[PDB]
Design a protein around this motif. Structure first.
Motif, PDB file in Angstrom:
ATOM      1  N   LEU A   1      36.263  43.143  29.189  1.00  0.00           N
ATOM      2  CA  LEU A   1      36.913  42.475  30.311  1.00  0.00           C
ATOM      3  C   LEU A   1      36.640  40.978  30.292  1.00  0.00           C
ATOM      4  O   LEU A   1      37.541  40.172  30.553  1.00  0.00           O
ATOM      5  CB  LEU A   1      36.440  43.090  31.627  1.00  0.00           C
ATOM      6  CG  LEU A   1      37.084  42.533  32.897  1.00  0.00           C
ATOM      7  CD1 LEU A   1      38.581  42.795  32.912  1.00  0.00           C
ATOM      8  CD2 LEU A   1      36.425  43.134  34.126  1.00  0.00           C
TER       9      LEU A   1
ATOM     10  N   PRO B   1      35.441  46.511  46.633  1.00  0.00           N
ATOM     11  CA  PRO B   1      36.232  45.370  47.121  1.00  0.00           C
ATOM     12  C   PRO B   1      36.616  44.366  46.048  1.00  0.00           C
ATOM     13  O   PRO B   1      37.611  43.652  46.219  1.00  0.00           O
ATOM     14  CB  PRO B   1      35.312  44.734  48.172  1.00  0.00           C
ATOM     15  CG  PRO B   1      33.938  45.154  47.782  1.00  0.00           C
ATOM     16  CD  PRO B   1      34.076  46.519  47.188  1.00  0.00           C
ATOM     17  N   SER B   2      35.859  44.270  44.956  1.00  0.00           N
ATOM     18  CA  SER B   2      36.014  43.177  44.006  1.00  0.00           C
ATOM     19  C   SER B   2      36.904  43.523  42.818  1.00  0.00           C
ATOM     20  O   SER B   2      37.059  42.692  41.918  1.00  0.00           O
ATOM     21  CB  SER B   2      34.645  42.724  43.500  1.00  0.00           C
ATOM     22  OG  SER B   2      34.787  41.883  42.371  1.00  0.00           O
ATOM     23  N   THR B   3      37.490  44.716  42.786  1.00  0.00           N
ATOM     24  CA  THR B   3      38.361  45.077  41.677  1.00  0.00           C
ATOM     25  C   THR B   3      39.719  44.395  41.834  1.00  0.00           C
ATOM     26  O   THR B   3      39.949  43.608  42.756  1.00  0.00           O
ATOM     27  CB  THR B   3      38.522  46.591  41.585  1.00  0.00           C
ATOM     28  OG1 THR B   3      39.398  46.910  40.497  1.00  0.00           O
ATOM     29  CG2 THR B   3      39.108  47.154  42.874  1.00  0.00           C
ATOM     30  N   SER B   4      40.632  44.692  40.912  1.00  0.00           N
ATOM     31  CA  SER B   4      41.978  44.121  40.941  1.00  0.00           C
ATOM     32  C   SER B   4      42.951  45.106  41.586  1.00  0.00           C
ATOM     33  O   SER B   4      43.879  45.619  40.963  1.00  0.00           O
ATOM     34  CB  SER B   4      42.422  43.737  39.535  1.00  0.00           C
ATOM     35  OG  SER B   4      41.710  42.604  39.075  1.00  0.00           O
ATOM     36  N   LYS B   5      42.718  45.363  42.874  1.00  0.00           N
ATOM     37  CA  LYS B   5      43.610  46.202  43.660  1.00  0.00           C
ATOM     38  C   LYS B   5      44.580  45.410  44.523  1.00  0.00           C
ATOM     39  O   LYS B   5      45.463  46.014  45.139  1.00  0.00           O
ATOM     40  CB  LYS B   5      42.802  47.161  44.551  1.00  0.00           C
ATOM     41  CG  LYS B   5      42.152  46.523  45.773  1.00  0.00           C
ATOM     42  CD  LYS B   5      41.652  47.581  46.743  1.00  0.00           C
ATOM     43  CE  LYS B   5      40.360  48.216  46.262  1.00  0.00           C
ATOM     44  NZ  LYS B   5      39.198  47.303  46.426  1.00  0.00           N
ATOM     45  N   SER B   6      44.440  44.086  44.593  1.00  0.00           N
ATOM     46  CA  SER B   6      45.355  43.252  45.363  1.00  0.00           C
ATOM     47  C   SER B   6      46.411  42.571  44.506  1.00  0.00           C
ATOM     48  O   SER B   6      47.543  42.397  44.966  1.00  0.00           O
ATOM     49  CB  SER B   6      44.576  42.190  46.145  1.00  0.00           C
ATOM     50  OG  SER B   6      44.111  41.161  45.291  1.00  0.00           O
ATOM     51  N   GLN B   7      46.077  42.180  43.273  1.00  0.00           N
ATOM     52  CA  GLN B   7      47.097  41.638  42.381  1.00  0.00           C
ATOM     53  C   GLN B   7      48.188  42.659  42.104  1.00  0.00           C
ATOM     54  O   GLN B   7      49.333  42.285  41.827  1.00  0.00           O
ATOM     55  CB  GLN B   7      46.466  41.165  41.074  1.00  0.00           C
ATOM     56  CG  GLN B   7      45.548  39.974  41.243  1.00  0.00           C
ATOM     57  CD  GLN B   7      44.167  40.362  41.713  1.00  0.00           C
ATOM     58  OE1 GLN B   7      43.769  41.522  41.621  1.00  0.00           O
ATOM     59  NE2 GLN B   7      43.433  39.393  42.244  1.00  0.00           N
TER      60      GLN B   7
ATOM     61  N   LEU C   1      43.056  49.956  33.561  1.00  0.00           N
ATOM     62  CA  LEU C   1      43.590  50.597  34.762  1.00  0.00           C
ATOM     63  C   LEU C   1      44.867  51.367  34.426  1.00  0.00           C
ATOM     64  O   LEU C   1      45.900  51.259  35.092  1.00  0.00           O
ATOM     65  CB  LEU C   1      43.829  49.571  35.874  1.00  0.00           C
ATOM     66  CG  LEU C   1      42.593  49.093  36.645  1.00  0.00           C
ATOM     67  CD1 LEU C   1      41.699  48.183  35.813  1.00  0.00           C
ATOM     68  CD2 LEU C   1      43.020  48.387  37.926  1.00  0.00           C
TER      69      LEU C   1
ATOM     70  N   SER D   1      48.720  40.909  32.645  1.00  0.00           N
ATOM     71  CA  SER D   1      47.536  40.135  32.992  1.00  0.00           C
ATOM     72  C   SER D   1      46.417  40.987  33.573  1.00  0.00           C
ATOM     73  O   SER D   1      45.299  40.485  33.728  1.00  0.00           O
ATOM     74  CB  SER D   1      47.903  39.032  33.988  1.00  0.00           C
ATOM     75  OG  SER D   1      48.831  38.125  33.422  1.00  0.00           O
TER      76      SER D   1
ATOM     77  N   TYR E   1      43.872  44.208  33.273  1.00  0.00           N
ATOM     78  CA  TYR E   1      43.232  44.852  32.135  1.00  0.00           C
ATOM     79  C   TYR E   1      42.998  46.336  32.399  1.00  0.00           C
ATOM     80  O   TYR E   1      42.483  46.720  33.452  1.00  0.00           O
ATOM     81  CB  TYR E   1      41.910  44.147  31.830  1.00  0.00           C
ATOM     82  CG  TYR E   1      41.042  44.830  30.802  1.00  0.00           C
ATOM     83  CD1 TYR E   1      41.283  44.671  29.446  1.00  0.00           C
ATOM     84  CD2 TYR E   1      39.960  45.609  31.188  1.00  0.00           C
ATOM     85  CE1 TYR E   1      40.485  45.286  28.503  1.00  0.00           C
ATOM     86  CE2 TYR E   1      39.154  46.224  30.253  1.00  0.00           C
ATOM     87  CZ  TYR E   1      39.422  46.060  28.911  1.00  0.00           C
ATOM     88  OH  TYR E   1      38.625  46.674  27.974  1.00  0.00           O
TER      89      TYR E   1
HETATM   90  N1  LIG Z   1      40.765  44.682  35.319  1.00  0.00           N
HETATM   91  C1  LIG Z   1      40.944  43.366  35.573  1.00  0.00           C
HETATM   92  N2  LIG Z   1      41.841  42.628  34.883  1.00  0.00           N
HETATM   93  C2  LIG Z   1      42.022  41.316  35.130  1.00  0.00           C
HETATM   94  N3  LIG Z   1      41.333  40.643  36.071  1.00  0.00           N
HETATM   95  C3  LIG Z   1      40.398  41.259  36.833  1.00  0.00           C
HETATM   96  C4  LIG Z   1      40.152  42.689  36.620  1.00  0.00           C
HETATM   97  N4  LIG Z   1      39.199  43.055  37.493  1.00  0.00           N
HETATM   98  C5  LIG Z   1      38.859  41.957  38.212  1.00  0.00           C
HETATM   99  N5  LIG Z   1      39.581  40.888  37.823  1.00  0.00           N
HETATM  100  C6  LIG Z   1      39.447  39.531  38.406  1.00  0.00           C
HETATM  101  O1  LIG Z   1      38.637  39.631  39.581  1.00  0.00           O
HETATM  102  C7  LIG Z   1      39.366  39.237  40.745  1.00  0.00           C
HETATM  103  C8  LIG Z   1      39.697  40.477  41.563  1.00  0.00           C
HETATM  104  O2  LIG Z   1      39.713  40.197  42.964  1.00  0.00           O
HETATM  105  P1  LIG Z   1      40.852  40.831  43.911  1.00  0.00           P
HETATM  106  O3  LIG Z   1      41.686  41.763  43.073  1.00  0.00           O
HETATM  107  O4  LIG Z   1      41.555  39.709  44.633  1.00  0.00           O
HETATM  108  O5  LIG Z   1      40.041  41.715  44.985  1.00  0.00           O
HETATM  109  P2  LIG Z   1      40.711  43.019  45.657  1.00  0.00           P
HETATM  110  O6  LIG Z   1      39.827  44.161  45.219  1.00  0.00           O
HETATM  111  O7  LIG Z   1      40.688  42.717  47.134  1.00  0.00           O
HETATM  112  O8  LIG Z   1      42.096  43.091  45.067  1.00  0.00           O
HETATM  113  C9  LIG Z   1      40.625  38.538  40.271  1.00  0.00           C
HETATM  114  O9  LIG Z   1      40.482  37.117  40.353  1.00  0.00           O
HETATM  115  C10 LIG Z   1      40.800  38.979  38.834  1.00  0.00           C
HETATM  116  O10 LIG Z   1      41.190  37.879  38.007  1.00  0.00           O
END
Ligand SMILES: Nc1ncnc2c1ncn2[C@@H]1O[C@H](COP(=O)(O)OP(=O)(O)O)[C@@H](O)[C@H]1O
Ligand SMILES: [Mg+2]
Ligand SMILES: [Zn+2]
Ligand SMILES: [Zn+2]
Ligand SMILES: [Zn+2]
Ligand SMILES: [Zn+2]
Lengths: 654, 297, 535, 293
Positions: free
Chosen positions: A529, A379-385, A342, A338, A340
């Motif tokens: 994306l 801050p807004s990247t997908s570093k927490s998922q 990275l 899920s 993308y």
């Molecule tokens: N490369 C990616 N692939 C899938 N979803 C992404 C990607 N980059 C951003 N997103 C979306 O943007 C949001 C990222 O926020 P989040 O990861 O929670 O912030 P943080 O940087 O604190 O981890 C998620 O809701 C995600 O679905």
């Protein structure tokens, strides 16, 4: 014909149906008789426990009622099944004239353990009318009381003629004789109890943190109490995630020790009958940490299995998959589908999961292949998922936030038990996560006092405690995955990373990898994306060349457990050359992360992990080069000015 | 089973308007609710129709046990009648049969709970009556004179306890005489029996030892909740006060913290629990027993 | 009224006697010689090797005793008494087995072996005072003045059950005579799981050990000891409230003419030990002389410390000469002059200072390692456990008390609080800790040495400032650290390549690439010998 | 403020195999004997019991020869332990009478009184000795004195004079309770509060706090008799021997002094040397020879 009062069970009908089901059943390898070979293998190996999947009974036509009877009246049905199993075993051995040594089986005991009872709705959702039913639970172990002896045979003596009596407990009561049974000696009230001569059983109490699937509105976590008997004692360790099957019970409690008065409101607990410590959605516990417990299990003859089983077909498929040449990128793409691209982040996560090799020097000395990673970026990247995926895939670990933690709460504490009313020790997050992965979010909001403790664990994987009542050192063999938010709003590429992140520069040099997640505006990447994200909403359920999670976990577990790479001279030369090269490049200060011996250690660990991947046993030049390339790419030194430590925004590639 | 008082009032008014006499069952229930529960239970048990569906393997163990008990009752009755007729020593025969035999009382064969609900303001206004039981009140206004009545309280919940089993009748089994002994309990604590009380063991010289049987017992699902005053009800310059509510049976899990509710209940006393030295006479503690819940949202 | 008898108990008695009288290029018999030695030296205990007891009668006696030691102990005592009477002329005798085939863990105990003899290992945490124990009481009857003597207790206060003379039929009415009874020395000890057996993600276990007779005052807090003895059970009142059905005992009312004493059966497992030995001259004086006669002995010594770390010769020369201390002096006016040495190693986290602490704690005889933030005031110094179940208070030692005349390793020294800093200050000033809690006052010795690791206040050692400006310690404590070793990084290609080669050699070859001039046992022997010269 | 909890039972299963020498089986056997025994093709005892109930005389007269003929074990048991067996037979009679009365009513009884008759050999009054204590004996003599009717209680209602706790007692040496029973009898939760008041003063009703309420009690009749050996056979030079007898209920006002009678009774003792006791007889049956019409 003859039911049992209160129930609707008929012993004759139940035993006949069970025997018929045992003698005829198959999965419909799928055509052959199943329980017959299980019985034969059991009597061959000397085992005494039969793990019965309660769902199986619901397939065969006859036992469609025995299923509900087992669910509703376990007490009688379990004994009926045990007697039927023993009769079936003796019949199997005798009807075919295998061998005449059957006394041992005719004398020993057996047992049957149901382990796939239907889904439950959570402990709080039950009612009083569900007492003495069969249920299952999911939770995390927290504490376990020491072994408690329970009397089974009381031993009495006559203080005038030495005559000795033995009495068997009956439903928890002992009938003390009032007169010596001897005709010569029948003095009244002469029986005395000799405590040490009695025969005792084993009992243990475990505290469980339930994690129900469905949670109603405004409901908070709690704890449950489990009772385990005989073999199962000492089969669980705090921090383990388990699935338990047992019977729902109730009991009244004495108001005070002095009186014999009881309280109207009852106390509820669970009586364990089966425990499952394996799953297909998560890895298997690192066997390097539980060496002694395996020998203890073998000695105790408890049949709980710590690791999943592997078939020859599965091994052949694993070899075939490892044979191909795109395996590395394939696995990287497989991790977290899920998320993308990275690619390098996913590769680092994969290498962390694989881990290095754990050396152990005879005559004392320990080295571990744990790998620590920290994520910096916008801050807004997908570093927490990424943190969630690792938490839910790893066997053991805890997910914590920097500001919601404390020094004591991370190591240990002492608390008053509400039942026994005494003081007992409890484990912290860092000890609970032993052998797994500890996730830290917002690592840069953590206080200096709190951060103090991480040094020792990241240095030697142990924590030393000198507090009231305890002076000792504990193992904390866990990897660290941390995230951080750069100072201000966005990572300014016109300043050094040390001026962007709110951490002491010296602390950074301890981590094996450092990742800079930079957000660059580009129409192609934005389109890709956006399409990837929007595709997920096409239909109400997910449908997204990726391996399945079960196969991925199986492969990773096999690779971790069965192989151990070692280093060679061709790798040693490259390591030394690369380390000297790093030390020289960049040689006015605090503009970059100064190279140290931790970087050489990181190369060693990453090369060992890469070699362990793809089922090798010798680390080589390709592995060393890949490790160095990954280390450099993580910090993306290629786009950095080696004089001012600034970033050239146009050179980085999405 | 939910008994609504608007139905009772309509029945009474229908009886009146066409001439025939009727009593004020509504006022009687309102003033002495706690006593009419048993009257209603017995009236219903005297009329419960027979089951039109056989009992299968997908039924509750409770219902299984109740059916077994009823069949066993019929068996003893028939056996006793046959034995007495055989002697050659029908209403008299029947009467002696009931007199000389033991049975399972109706409460151990009932399977349902019974609740009341208050009189609606609309119905009372239309019929020209004053619905006392449906006038909302604060914990401030509920005084001692209201004890034993059916009243409605308007408040906000603050705490709810988990559901736990509360025992009402304990059951023991005597191996010597094969009897089942039932011990009632209506206190916060009780004492377990030791020796049999059945007729055979009572007359014999060697009495059997009782044992405890959880399955045959009579349990109740019990919760306790704390309700608190609303802001607009508190007088000027005072602090809001609280009150205690008990929930029994199928009405559990209907209250969650933060709910602004109207709870109907019977107001009952309880034994004193403060320090001895401050006790002056027969002081008592109060609580509400829940019968109906209405949410504001 | 003839008394029932245990034929098996007797048979094992005669078997034991035959063993004693039979078990023996000069041949010799050991047990008779030991009995003669006991007669000569007025002792009370016999030492019987378990191994010697095995190779006879196909070991049936060995098993019978092992799984039924409790049952047969009185018969063993009787046989010992008879043989002693035969071969030699009130005395209380004890037997002591040891050298068992295997050793169990505290984590691997089970209720199946209750009443059986076994062996355990663990670390002692606490000890109580030696107190007399009621062994064989004497009572006086009430309705008549008859006197009964030598009433055994068997782990609980037992009274006579019937008046011995038919002239009086007294039962359950007696008075205890404390003037003509016998007592034995009795002590309680608390042991804890050893460090390296604790399973993953769990806290250590603790166990009680009861010592009797002359074995008392042989344990010492903070050591690792091996016990051999029986496993027993004792009443436990705390188990009430736990889930499950707890056994109860009631009297049988059947068969008694007519015309309530119910008890609970909850217990906990304890251990009554019989032999205790601590677990860590001879020909080696030859090697000692050979090595002392060396000329570069000092250089070899210096090279032998912490072989796993590279360089830092000064730090090694400090760790040595901290292992060996000075001499304490006393002046005529009562002034005492210290003879101990304290060391501080200053460096940023990226350095390898903690390895020295780990090596010292792993090598030195009496040493305790602790971290700055994972400790507390009570953890250091001491505590008072007033809840001694049988009587007065007791003192539970702390980190500082542990390693007395030894070395204490303090990591993350800069994070210690004002209170514990003051405690350490007092420890260095006078070799004493003053305890004042719960109305109990005490003074406890702390003749120790301190090895502390410290970080620069600002993370990095700013070379522009002075040591006082770089550290965080308080002036009083700082003044008494006579050695400050500041470690710093120097970039040089040959040093870098040598260090990388060394690390890779360790990883690839493991234990092979260590080759130190001297081994740990040799070093410990040398230090022990050298610590007693008083120059 | 709550009420008292209740207790009750019901039979479900079959216990252990009944033994022969237990009270329930004894009662069952006696009931069978009453309802089945035949002489000359007649249900003599059933018929006379029915007639007695019709006449309002709550007693049954039985002959021991019939019982020994029907069954021997219970006969021996009765002859050896009369004090233990008689109540069982009495309650069996009561049980049967309940059914007979209830059936007849359509077509509040006390305990029925058993009366025994016999014709076996007698024992001269001079041969009674220790061996006959507590057995059943048959004697012959002449009545010389009968006392006046006394009064004894069979059902008492009592009240505690301090806390007004009421209760009842039934008889069939009973003494009133020594101390108030309201403490041990924890009737209700509010009773615990009522048992304490006025600060720290404990509640103590005192010794013997109970009084009898005569308006709601029931009494019976008791009488004493004296029986002496026939003066003809007395040894010369010695005054004759005499003996004391006690009878009650329906055996009162049956004879007058001077009648020559046969007596069936129990040889017992009481306390009025070192360990001497005064023997006497409990009347079970009287048989007159018809005198002085
Ligand atoms: N490369 C990616 N692939 C899938 N979803 C992404 C990607 N980059 C951003 N997103 C979306 O943007 C949001 C990222 O926020 P989040 O990861 O929670 O912030 P943080 O940087 O604190 O981890 C998620 O809701 C995600 O679905
Ligand atoms: Mg996020
Ligand atoms: Zn005896
Ligand atoms: Zn009974
Ligand atoms: Zn005496
Ligand atoms: Zn009174």
């Amino acid at each position: 014909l003859r039911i049992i009062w209160g129930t609707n069970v008929s012993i004759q009908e139940c035993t006949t149906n069970f025997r018929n089901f045992l003698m005829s059943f198959k999965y419909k390898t799928d055509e052959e008789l199943y329980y017959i070979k299980q019985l034969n293998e059991m009597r061959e190996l000397g085992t005494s426990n039969l793990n019965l999947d309660a769902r199986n009974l619901l397939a065969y036509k006859q036992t469609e009622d025995l299923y509900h009877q087992l669910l509703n009246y376990p007490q009688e049905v379990i004994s009926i099944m045990d007697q039927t199993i023993k009769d079936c075993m003796v019949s199997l051995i005798v009807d075919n004239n295998l061998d005449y040594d059957l006394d041992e089986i005719e004398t020993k005991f057996y047992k049957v353990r149901p382990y796939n009872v239907g889904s439950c709705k959570g402990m709080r959702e039950l009612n009083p009318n569900d007492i003495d039913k069969l249920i299952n639970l999911k939770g995390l172990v927290l504490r376990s009381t020491p072994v408690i002896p329970d009397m089974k045979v009381a031993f009495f003596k006559c203080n005038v003629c030495d005559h000795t009596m033995a009495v068997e407990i009956d439903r928890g009561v002992i009938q003390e004789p009032a007169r010596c049974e001897r005709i010569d000696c029948n003095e009244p009230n002469s029986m005395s109890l000799i405590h040490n001569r009695c025969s005792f059983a084993d009992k243990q109490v475990i505290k469980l943190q339930e994690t129900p699937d469905f949670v109603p509105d405004g409901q908070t976590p709690h704890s449950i109490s489990l009772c385990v008997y005989d073999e199962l004692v000492d089969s669980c360790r705090a921090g383990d995630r388990i699935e338990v099957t047992g019977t729902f019970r109730s009991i009244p409690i004495r108001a005070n020790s002095r009186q014999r008065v009881l309280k109207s409101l009852y106390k509820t607990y669970v009586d364990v009958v089966h425990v499952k410590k394996v799953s297909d959605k998560r890895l298997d516990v690192d066997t390097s940490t539980i060496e002694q417990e395996l020998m203890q299990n073998k000695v105790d003859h408890n049949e709980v299995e710590e690791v999943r089983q592997i078939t020859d077909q599965d091994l052949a498929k694993i070899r075939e998959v490892a044979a191909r040449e795109d395996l590395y990128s394939l696995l990287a793409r497989s991790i977290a589908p899920s998320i993308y691209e990275l690619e390098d982040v996913k590769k680092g996560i994969l290498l962390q999961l694989f881990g290095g090799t754990n050396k152990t020097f005879t005559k004392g000395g320990r080295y571990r292949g744990d790998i620590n990673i920290l994520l910096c970026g916008d801050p807004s990247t997908s570093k927490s998922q990424i943190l969630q995926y690792v938490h839910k895939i790893t066997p053991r670990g805890v997910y914590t936030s920097g500001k919601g933690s404390s020094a004591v709460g991370l190591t240990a504490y002492i608390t008053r038990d509400v039942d026994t009313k005494q003081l007992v020790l409890e484990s912290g997050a860092l000890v609970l996560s032993d052998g797994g992965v500890c996730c830290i979010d917002e690592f840069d909001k953590m206080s200096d006092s709190t951060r103090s403790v991480l040094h020792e664990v990241m240095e030697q994987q142990t924590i030393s405690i000198a507090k009231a009542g305890i002076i000792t050192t504990l193992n904390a063999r866990s990897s660290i995955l941390a995230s951080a938010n750069p100072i201000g709003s966005r990572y300014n590429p016109n300043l050094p990373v040390t001026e962007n992140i709110d951490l002491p520069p010296p602390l950074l040099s301890r981590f094996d990898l450092v990742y800079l997640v930079l957000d660059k505006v580009d129409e192609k990447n934005d389109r890709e994306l956006a399409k990837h994200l929007t595709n997920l909403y096409l239909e109400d359920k997910p449908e997204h060349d990726v391996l399945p999670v079960e196969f991925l976990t199986m492969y990773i577990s096999y690779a971790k457990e069965h192989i151990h790479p070692i280093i060679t001279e061709a790798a040693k030369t490259e390591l030394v050359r690369a380390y000297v090269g790093m030390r020289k490049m960049g040689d006015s200060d605090e503009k970059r992360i100064t190279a140290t011996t931790r970087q050489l250690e990181s190369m060693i660990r990453l090369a060992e992990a890469h070699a362990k991947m793809k089922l090798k046993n010798v680390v080589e030049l390709e592995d060393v080069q890949e490790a160095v390339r990954l280390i450099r790419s993580a910090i993306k030194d290629y786009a950095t000015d080696p004089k001012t430590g600034k970033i050239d925004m146009n050179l980085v590639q999405t | 089973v939910i008994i609504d008082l608007d139905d009772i009032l309509q029945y009474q008014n229908e009886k009146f308007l066409q001439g025939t006499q009727a009593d004020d069952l509504v006022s009687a229930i309102q003033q002495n609710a706690n006593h009419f529960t048993e009257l209603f239970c017995r009236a219903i048990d005297n009329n419960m129709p027979l089951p039109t569906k056989e009992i299968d393997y997908k039924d509750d163990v409770l219902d299984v046990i109740l059916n077994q008990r009823r069949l066993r009752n019929e068996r003893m009755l028939s056996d006793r009648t046959n034995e007495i007729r055989s002697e050659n020593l029908n209403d008299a025969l029947r009467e002696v049969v009931e007199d000389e035999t033991e049975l399972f009382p109706p409460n151990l064969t009932r399977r349902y709970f019974l609740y009341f609900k208050p009189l609606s303001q609309n119905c009372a206004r239309r019929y020209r009556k004053k619905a006392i039981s449906s006038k909302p009140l604060s914990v401030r206004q509920i005084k001692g004179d209201f004890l034993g009545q059916l009243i409605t309280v308007r408040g906000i919940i603050t705490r709810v306890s988990d559901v736990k089993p509360a025992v009402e009748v304990i059951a023991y089994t005597c191996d010597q005489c094969g009897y089942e002994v039932f011990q009632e309990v209506n206190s916060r604590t009780f004492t377990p029996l030791s020796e049999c009380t059945s007729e055979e063991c009572s007359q014999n010289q060697t009495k059997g030892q009782l044992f405890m049987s959880t399955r045959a017992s009579k349990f109740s699902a019990f919760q306790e909740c704390k309700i608190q005053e609303l802001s607009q009800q508190v007088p000027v310059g005072h602090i809001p006060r609280s009150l205690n509510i008990h929930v029994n049976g199928t009405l559990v899990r209907s209250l969650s913290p933060g709910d602004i509710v109207d709870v109907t209940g019977i107001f009952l006393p309880a034994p004193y629990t403060g320090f001895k030295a401050l006790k002056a006479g027969l002081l008592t503690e109060t609580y509400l027993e829940a019968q109906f819940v209405r949410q504001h949202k | 009224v003839k008394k029932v008898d245990d034929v098996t108990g007797e048979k094992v008695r005669e078997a034991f006697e035959q063993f004693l009288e039979d078990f023996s290029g000069e041949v010799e018999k050991v047990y008779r010689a030991q009995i003669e030695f006991m007669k000569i030296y007025d002792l009370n205990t016999i030492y019987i090797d378990y191994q010697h007891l095995s190779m006879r009668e196909n070991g049936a006696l060995a098993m019978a005793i092992s799984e039924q030691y409790y049952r047969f102990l009185p018969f063993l005592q009787k046989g010992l008494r008879r043989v002693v009477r035969k071969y030699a002329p009130e005395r209380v005798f004890q037997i002591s087995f040891f050298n068992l085939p295997t050793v169990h863990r505290i984590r691997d105990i089970r209720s199946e072996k209750i009443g059986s003899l076994l062996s355990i290992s663990g670390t002692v945490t606490r000890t109580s005072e030696v107190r007399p124990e009621l062994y064989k009481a004497s009572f006086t009857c009430d309705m008549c003045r008859a006197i009964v003597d030598n009433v055994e207790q068997s782990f609980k206060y037992t009274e006579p059950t019937f008046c011995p003379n038919p002239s009086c039929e007294n039962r359950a009415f007696w008075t205890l005579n404390v003037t003509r009874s016998r007592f034995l020395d009795w002590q309680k000890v608390r042991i804890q799981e050893n460090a390296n057996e604790i399973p993953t993600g769990s806290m250590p276990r603790t166990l009680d050990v009861i010592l009797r007779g002359d074995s008392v005052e042989r344990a010492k807090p903070g050591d690792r000891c091996k016990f051999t003895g029986v496993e027993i059970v004792v009443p436990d009142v705390t188990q009430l409230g736990l889930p499950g059905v707890k056994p109860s005992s009631t009297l049988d009312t059947r068969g008694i003419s007519k015309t309530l004493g119910v008890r609970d059966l909850t217990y906990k497992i304890s251990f009554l030990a019989c032999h205790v030995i601590s677990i860590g001259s001879s020909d080696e004086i030859n090697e000692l002389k050979e090595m002392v006669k060396d000329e570069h002995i000092y250089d070899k010594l210096v090279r032998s410390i912490a072989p796993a770390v590279f360089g830092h010769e000064a730090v090694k020369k400090g760790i040595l000469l901290q292992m060996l201390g000075g001499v304490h002096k006393s002046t005529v006016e009562g002034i005492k002059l210290r003879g101990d040495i304290n060391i501080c190693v200053v460096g940023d986290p990226s350095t390898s200072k903690s390895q020295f602490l780990k090596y010292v704690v792993g090598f030195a005889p009496r040493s305790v390692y602790t971290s700055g933030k994972a400790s507390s005031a009570a953890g250091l110094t001491a505590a008072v456990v007033r809840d001694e179940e049988g009587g007065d208070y007791t003192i539970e030692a702390g980190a500082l008390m542990l390693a007395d005349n030894g070395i204490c390793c303090i990591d993350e020294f800069d994070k210690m609080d004002i209170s514990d800093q003051v405690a350490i200050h007092e420890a260095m000033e006078q070799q004493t800790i003053s305890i004042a809690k719960a109305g109990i006052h005490a003074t406890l010795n702390a003749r120790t040495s301190i090895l502390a690791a410290a970080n620069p206040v600002g993370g990095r050692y700013n070379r522009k400032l002075s040591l006082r400006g770089n550290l965080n310690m308080t002036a009083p404590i700082m003044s008494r650290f006579d050695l400050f070793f500041v470690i710093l990084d120097d970039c040089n290609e040959k040093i870098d390549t040598e260090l990388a080669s060394h690390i890779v050699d360790l990883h690839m070859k493991r234990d092979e690439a260590i080759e130190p001039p001297f081994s740990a046992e040799q070093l410990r022997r040398y230090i022990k010998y050298a610590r007693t010269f008083k120059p | 403020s709550f009420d008292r909890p209740e207790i009750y039972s019901a039979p479900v299963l079959q216990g252990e195999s009944p033994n022969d020498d237990d009270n329930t089986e004894i009662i069952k056997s006696f009931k069978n004997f009453i309802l089945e025994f035949r002489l000359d093709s007649q249900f003599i005892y059933r018929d006379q019991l029915r007639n007695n109930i019709l006449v309002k005389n709550y007693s049954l007269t039985v002959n021991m020869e019939h019982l020994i003929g029907y069954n021997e074990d219970i006969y021996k048991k009765l002859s050896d332990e009369p004090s233990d067996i008689i109540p069982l037979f009495e309650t069996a009679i009561t049980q049967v009478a309940k059914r007979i009365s209830i059936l007849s009513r359509a077509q509040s009884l006390p305990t029925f009184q058993l009366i025994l008759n016999s014709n076996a050999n007698q024992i001269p009054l001079r041969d009674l000795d220790s061996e006959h204590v507590s057995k059943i004996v048959r004697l012959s003599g002449i009545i010389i004195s009968t006392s006046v009717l006394s009064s004894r209680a069979t059902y008492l209602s009592i009240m505690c004079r301090n806390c007004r706790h009421t209760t009842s007692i039934t008889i069939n040496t009973v003494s009133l309770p020594r101390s108030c029973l309201s403490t041990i009898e924890s009737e209700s939760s509010m009773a615990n509060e009522s048992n304490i008041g006025d600060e720290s003063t404990k509640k103590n009703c005192g010794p013997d706090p109970y009084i009898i309420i005569h308006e709601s009690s029931k009494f019976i009749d008791q009488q004493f008799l004296k029986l002496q050996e026939i003066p003809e056979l007395v040894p010369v030079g010695e005054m004759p021997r005499n003996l004391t007898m006690t009878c009650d209920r329906y055996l009162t006002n049956k004879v007058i002094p001077g009648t020559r009678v046969t007596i069936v009774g129990i040889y017992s003792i009481y306390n009025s040397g070192v360990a001497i006791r005064t023997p006497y007889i409990k009347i079970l049956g009287i048989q007159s020879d018809v005198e002085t019409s």
